[PDB]
């Protein structure tokens, strides 16, 4: 599916490593500012 | 400045759209006005659709405010 045709959940699905895990960083931007 | 090109472009339309009236079509205008009166008196305009009425009103107002323009001359 072309990049223009997805929602953030889509990459949550296809690329779990890109997930923004909600446990180790409850807040925003959901992990530190390295 | 680029006044000349666009100004000539605008004369191209003005000389064919800004013209003063000529006695030739006066009968056509008056018969059209009478036809409008006929459509009004019996309530035939009720046959029209909204868009047409909006457009007619817009053009009527177009004619109108140019009346105040005429005053602006004065």
């Amino acid at each position: 599916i072309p990049f223009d045709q997805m929602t953030i959940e889509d990459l949550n699905e296809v690329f779990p490593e890109t997930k923004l895990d909600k446990k180790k960083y409850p807040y925003w931007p959901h992990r530190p500012i390295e | 400045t680029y006044s000349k090109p666009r100004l000539a472009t605008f004369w191209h339309y003005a000389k064919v759209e800004l013209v003063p009236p000529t006695p030739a079509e006066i009968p056509t205008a008056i018969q059209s006005l009478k036809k409008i009166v006929n459509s009004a008196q019996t309530g035939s305009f009720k046959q029209l659709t909204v868009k047409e009425a909006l457009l007619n009103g817009l053009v009527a107002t177009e004619v109108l405010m140019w009346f105040y323009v005429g005053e602006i001359i004065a």
Binding site: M6, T7 | Y13, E17, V59, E62, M65, Y68
Partner: protein, 94 residues
């Protein structure tokens, strides 16, 4: 699963007033109908003093001058900037 974008929104004359309005008005006067319409509207408003003139008017003039300056001199560059960011995210995620 999302629909895509169009390629360009409705064009706009002078940057403010959409064209379609020019089309709905075409049949009766064709070309120089809407423009004289607008000129009349504005000469009316200025002439019937529904719009007085004061200092804040000239404030409006200066702010609009600055804005037209910036848009005309940087719009294309900012657009290319934005598209660069988009394709950059594409690649870097690619």
């Amino acid at each position: 699963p999302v629909p895509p974008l169009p390629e360009h929104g409705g064009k706009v004359r002078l940057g403010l007033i959409p064209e379609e309005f020019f089309q709905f008005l075409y049949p009766k006067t064709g070309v120089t109908g809407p423009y004289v319409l607008g000129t009349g509207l504005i000469l009316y408003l200025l002439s019937k003093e529904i719009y007085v003139i004061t200092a804040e008017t000239f404030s409006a003039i200066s702010t609009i001058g600055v804005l037209v300056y910036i848009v005309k001199k940087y719009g294309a560059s900012i657009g290319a900037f934005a598209d660069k960011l988009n394709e950059q995210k594409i690649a870097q995620l690619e």
